[PDB]
Paper text:
Human telomerase is comprised of two distinct functional lobes tethered by telomerase RNA (hTR): a catalytic core, responsible for DNA extension; and a Hinge and [name] (H/[name]) box [name], responsible for telomerase biogenesis. The telomerase H/[name] [name] contains two H/[name] heterotetramers of [name], NOP10, NHP2, and GAR1, each assembled on the 5’ and 3’ RNA hairpins of hTR. Furthermore, the telomerase H/[name] [name] also contains a Cajal body localization factor, TCAB1. The catalytic pseudouridine synthase subunit of H/[name] RNPs (Cbf5 in archaea and yeast, and [name] in human) converts a substrate uridine to a pseudouridine (Ψ).
Our telomerase holoenzyme sample was prepared without the addition of an RNA substrate for pseudouridylation. Therefore, we had anticipated to find the [name] thumb loop in an open conformation. However, focused classification revealed a subset of particles with a well-resolved thumb loop for the 3’ [name] (inset). Surprisingly, we observed that the 3’ [name] thumb loop adopts a nearly closed, or “semi-closed”, conformation, resembling the closed conformation observed in the substrate-bound archaeal complex. We observe direct interactions between the 3’ [name] thumb loop and an unpaired region of hTR. Nucleotide G393 of hTR flips out of the RNA duplex towards the [name] active site, appearing analogous to the target U nucleotide in a canonical H/[name] [name]. Compared to the archaeal structures, the thumb loop and hTR are further away from the pseudouridylation active site. Whereas, in our structure, part of the P7 stem of the hTR 3’ hairpin mimics the PS2 helix. hTR, however, lacks an analogue to the PS1 helix. On the other hand, the pseudouridylation pocket of the telomerase RNA H/[name] 5’ hairpin is highly flexible and does not appear to mimic a PS2 helix near the 5’ [name] like its 3’ counterpart. Together, our structure reveals that hTR acts as a pseudosubstrate at the 3’ [name]. The ability of hTR to mimic a substrate-bound RNA explains why we observe the 3’ [name] thumb loop in a semi-closed conformation rather than an open conformation.
Residue numbers in the entry:
A (entry chain D): 66 to 159
B (entry chain H): 65 to 161
C (entry chain F), D (entry chain J): 1 to 64
E (entry chain K): 146 to 204, 209 to 443, 449 to 489, 510 to 522
F (entry chain E), G (entry chain I): 23 to 152
H (entry chain C): 23 to 186, 192 to 421
I (entry chain G): 43 to 395
Amino acid sequence: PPERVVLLGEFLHPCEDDIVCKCTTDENKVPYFNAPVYLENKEQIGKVDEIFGQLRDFYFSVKLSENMKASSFKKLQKFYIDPYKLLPLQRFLP
Amino acid sequence: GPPERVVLLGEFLHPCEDDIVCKCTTDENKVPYFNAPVYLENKEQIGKVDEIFGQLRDFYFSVKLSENMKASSFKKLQKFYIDPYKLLPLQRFLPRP
Amino acid sequence: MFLQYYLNEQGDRVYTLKKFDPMGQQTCSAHPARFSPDDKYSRHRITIKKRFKVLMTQQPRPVL
Amino acid sequence: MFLQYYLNEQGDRVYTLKKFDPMGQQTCSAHPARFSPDDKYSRHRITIKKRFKVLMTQQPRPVL
Amino acid sequence: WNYSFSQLPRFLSGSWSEFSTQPENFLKGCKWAPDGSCILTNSADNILRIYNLPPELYHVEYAEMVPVLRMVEGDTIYDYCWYSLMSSAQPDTSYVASSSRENPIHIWDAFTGELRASFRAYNHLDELTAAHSLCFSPDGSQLFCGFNRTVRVFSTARPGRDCEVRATFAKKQGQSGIISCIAFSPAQPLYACGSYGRSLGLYAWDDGSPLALLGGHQGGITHLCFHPDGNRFFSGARKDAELLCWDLRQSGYPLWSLGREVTTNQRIYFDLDPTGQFLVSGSTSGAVSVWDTDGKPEPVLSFLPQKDCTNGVSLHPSLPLLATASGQRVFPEPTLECRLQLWWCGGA
Amino acid sequence: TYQELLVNQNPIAQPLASRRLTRKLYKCIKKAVKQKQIRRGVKEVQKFVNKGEKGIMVLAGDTLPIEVYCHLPVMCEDRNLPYVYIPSKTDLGAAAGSKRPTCVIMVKPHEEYQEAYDECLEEVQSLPLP
Amino acid sequence: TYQELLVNQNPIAQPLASRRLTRKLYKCIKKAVKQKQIRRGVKEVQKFVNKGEKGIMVLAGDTLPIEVYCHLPVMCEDRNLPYVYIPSKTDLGAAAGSKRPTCVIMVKPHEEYQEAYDECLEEVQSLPLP
Amino acid sequence: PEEDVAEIQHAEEFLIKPESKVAKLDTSQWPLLLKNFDKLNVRTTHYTPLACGSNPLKREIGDYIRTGFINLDKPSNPSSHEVVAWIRRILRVEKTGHSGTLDPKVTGCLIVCIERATRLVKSQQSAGKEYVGIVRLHNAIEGGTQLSRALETLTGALFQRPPLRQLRVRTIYESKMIEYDPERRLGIFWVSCEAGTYIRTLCVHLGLLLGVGGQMQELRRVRSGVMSEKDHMVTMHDVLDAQWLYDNHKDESYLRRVVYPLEKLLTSHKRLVMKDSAVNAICYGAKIMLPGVLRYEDGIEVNQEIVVITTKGEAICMAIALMTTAVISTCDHGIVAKIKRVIMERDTYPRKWGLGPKASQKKLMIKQGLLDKHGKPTDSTPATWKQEYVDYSE
Amino acid sequence: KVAKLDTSQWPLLLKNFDKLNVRTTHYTPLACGSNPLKREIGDYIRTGFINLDKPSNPSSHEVVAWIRRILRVEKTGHSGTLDPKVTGCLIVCIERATRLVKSQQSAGKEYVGIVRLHNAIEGGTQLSRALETLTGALFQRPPLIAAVKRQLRVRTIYESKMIEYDPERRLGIFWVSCEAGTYIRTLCVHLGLLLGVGGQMQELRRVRSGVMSEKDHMVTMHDVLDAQWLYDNHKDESYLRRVVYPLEKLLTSHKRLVMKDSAVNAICYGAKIMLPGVLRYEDGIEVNQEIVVITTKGEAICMAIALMTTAVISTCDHGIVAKIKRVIMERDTYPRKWGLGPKASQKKLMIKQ
RNA sequence: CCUGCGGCGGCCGCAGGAAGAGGAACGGAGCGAGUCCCCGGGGCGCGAUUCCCUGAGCUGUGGGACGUGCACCCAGGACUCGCUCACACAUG
């Protein structure tokens, strides 16, 4: 269970056994691989498996936990992560 | 007399006017001496190397047969053997560096 | 292998998934022929490539 | 001897064993006339080669 | 059965149709196999043909003869012969030697007609020279063959270029010209060489040393025959009217001269009986003449096989059969078919 | 269609079979397919010709690149095998009894269909050199 | 038939005999050969023109290369000997009873064909000269 | 008339007449690094050529192969490591490398460098590359516009991960849709990208971004840096056949169509033509100083990668330019460039440093004890030498 | 009318001279040389060659002996032996042209011959395949001479072709392009072994000797005798000037290097070809390559070996462009004009002062 | 301090260097000799019995016999040790 959580990204259309999400993290900070994704109430949805797109605006797919289903999530529904599993652009950029 | 050992010289192709034409298949593409005795794997002399002809890395040779031998005796793809001292390396005939 | 091509008026490859050109004729396969290092048919390939004047040496010389 | 020839439309020798070319004309012997160093008929050959306009000096001069 | 020329020989089947394939074709002799099984014929088409002995003889009309083999050469055939010790009981003995223009001396198998061996004669420049004549030795071990100023002796057991060379002309002395025929004495250890240069030469078999040199003939000698006595022998030439009789005893000059019409540059053959009593010869006119050798040979008979040159005549070694080959070279003008024939010569 | 297939042709595809010879060859192949006498593809034909088999090698004139099968014509000439190019790759595969195109097949003789095989063989042996 | 041989003529083959004159010359050669009164080779014809033996010298107009016999026309003009060309070397050889060709023949005069000789001689000297 | 020309040739006198007009060269058709040799700025013409090397195109066959490369069309079974190992075995040569690892089932441009051309492999491996692949979508799409919009979105600097490690950044410069087939759900795409860009990963990201899912069906590399698939491209059969023809017919013709000299890879770079005496010094690891510059190209800038060449057109080394074109034209002395990678072998050209006037002066002063053993000043040095001689070690 | 002629129609080594790279256009012309076609008949023959059609009886050394009686010269050479019964292209160099014989003897030959097979083959295609087999670098035993067994050697056959075959006589015409010193008699023996039937070379004719062929400029021995006779008896050069050609015709394939008239005599004395004397130079001069050095009148001065490439010549201002291999031209054809130049004058001045 | 090569993307080890970049006659030619390389008795003419011969023997656009005479069997290249000519940067 996380101590505190910070926005991870909003819901985009689903994929085969995954949910693709557009990242809207503060200062564009990139999430770590295999990091747990949470709802607004700190209830874990899944785990981040792949991250893709341009350096400024990028997307992330979430490997769902066994209870959840990809079709259930609403349009532009927001998702969260613990702040200790985020990284700045300055590691990747130069 | 009979040599201590013999190395693969070549294999029988068609006869030609009472001597036998053979494709040369030596290791390292070595070339036989002129009038070098040709043996069968039993170390019995069948003849001597008369002509050497064809491309450098795919060459043939004719064999002038012995007194008692006949060109009809040999079968297709039958192997012939030579005293290894009576070969020369291909490098000798290739141009100087 | 699905990738095909037909040559443009400029001379460069126009890639396509179809097996015929817009002008009717067959598209060639994009990939080169299979090769194995044990191949001993260099004499054979050269011999007929000389006959039909399609050996690489007999073509017009490139611009350097 | 055995070699004959006839000229094609661009003046090249076309060698052949047959005594007649594909248009029914006789083929020439490939080999030149037999020569003697003690030949004393130089006057005579110039005399009629001039007469019939077939001496080498009367032909079109070669382009060098 | 025994030979008898008290009557004119009775006709027996011959072949004409196959020789008429080429225009202006003609036969160049005929020769029985020494066992008497078949007859060999040369022709201007350069095709040696073997005809079997007619089955209808032992079995009346006879059909036109057909050859059991045709063995093609690629150039003019100068000479040809059966193996000396041939028997049809042995496939190893039944073969035909043959020499041709700028080619090796080919050995043809007389049953299957395949090229069995090749003897090759090279000059000092290592260029192949063709033999103008052929003759096997009476043992069948060696193959003697004539060239310009030289005889070569190949060993029949080892076919190839290997040969003992025997010069007949050395420092402008000896028998000159192309040696056109060789023949061995049945009794003596010698052989006789005829040349297109007028002379005859006798030579010892083992060494090749000259025994004698004989003149006589007014043209190039074309054929030789030894009598079964061993002492007496006969010779004939091209563009020369006389067939000369010789003897090994009282040598140096021919004993008798027998007339025959020869007006071409041809090898007009002649042959003796197996017994040795009769001698038969062809002619350019066509008339086949017969002489009884047993004094001068007495004329017995003259008959005409066809209205054309009779170049070949051959007598069968056991039976009374005369074979005759016909034809000659036709000469042009600015703008009868040749044939082999057999003849029964037995008594009434 | 035969004359249209000449537009698709390969630089080395000669001697090309005529419109009628192409028809005769397909039917000889189909008969050989029923008796299972043919050999299909480069890998099999190359193996069997090297092994010692004899027959007629039918090549496809639409084949590209030429390096896939341009060694085969000389493999025939080393062993005196007759060969011939037919216009199409897709037609050869259909005649050979396969769902896809094929670049080369070798038809072997059989007592069932020697009359058709002999008509093709002698006509293919008679083909003039380019 | 005569006009076909006219294609094979040399640059120097003039004066060429007329078709009927060619036939007269062959018939004169046949009679001279029978009488043993001709010379055949360049080797021979050249030798007896040097000695100064008279006769009608007949030449083959299709002889090539011309260097073998082209000295002979002037050798005749030095000695005022009558010469003439005829269509072919094979027919000139055939006229002398030979299967092989020849490029020149010189016919000597003789009693047995003296009238035929004079008839040929008359027409040869009457020819237009180039 | 042909005969009228022939008559003039024998009658009238011919002469290459004297003229006062300026002699103007045309070097636009000269091969490789000698192309437009005339257009280079000339510092000096005074030097002594050595006659040791050769024009790159006319090296002897052994030296030609050792200093050369093949623009290979890679076949579809073997790995890239296996392909260069075959070429190493075929050409009977010691070392071989390539311009970027293609996966076993991928075909296309693979610049196989041979022996001494393997010094360029790092430069060829870092060069920009173009691909043509087929993406296989798992489910159906409305139209080809959607797959093009996905490629439009992924044009730029992207996040990527290798196939089966850390997250990596890879730029895709340009992307395009060639065509799409809705029946079999295959779409041909063309992409220009930097080196090390994972195209399998791109196909997966196109699948995720569309929503349908997808993967790479097949791939082909059409460009590798300077070389393309319409520029002298050759197959493994050609490489084998060309070597065979040289072995059995003694005919170099086919090898010289297959292999090209490494100087053909460097034709894009700006040139600095060195004096023949300075060549071997640079091969041993010297500084590229001003006394040895004969010619220098227009538009050289500071920190620019330049090719340093001989007067015969051979490449000596890749180098980093320290002076601009305008500075080289006006300065008296200094370091013009520093070595990045030495291409040419040691002792190709002879060993001719320390023979000049100023170098021999320094040697003499060290012998006289006016300078120290390591060429450094003393209290006794003249003020003329001490002021003028700008020692570059500093 | 020379002004109307395009430079492509200028004779011999001056052909296409405007497409040579121009170093400098200025020099002082001297009235010394002539164009090689206008040499005085004596000099023309002493620097000339004959493209002879060899007859079929004599040896090739007899033929060139006969040519040196006729023309009345002391030296001749002959571009590779033809055997006594062989005919065809025999380049006979006369006098000063004998300096070129190694380049002519080493050049690639072509032959048209007849092979006679000793038994029947299937057809013309079978002979055509045995010829393809004997293409490339072949083993051939050189024939025995003076009982000296020369070792097996390699000679290349560039192309082969089967022209005709006669199944009746078993004769086959072949055309062969090959390296110098190839034995065609030996080729026919091998061609016979390879077929299995056996064989011999019936006949042979050489149809090319490097630059010259039987297509053009070829003359028979009669022409050589006949042309000399016309000159001896009527004082007419015209016939000899079509039999004999100047040695420059043998050198038209080589890369050229045009020199100033000042330099010409220096090079004839054994001076190395220096860069200040070069007027023009061809594209594609490589290091250690044999080049022809010529005058502005198109006369060959020497065969030289290039020590500068084309590009190097363009960049430099002085030094050795080429060293001499063989000097063709006589000494003092041109006058001595060396030592007069600016730097050479400065050197001699500063030695004196 | 630089370069190159190899080992596991920076370091390690080994190896070659420490480099200011020279020289507008260097050190050539042409002959001759010795030694290597190269390096398939024949060729030409005339004479007399038309000198013989349309041979199935190449062959009359040539083959042979006997007299006789005649001219061929080099020229190059490389190495080595002489003689001769130069020691030449090419005249704006």
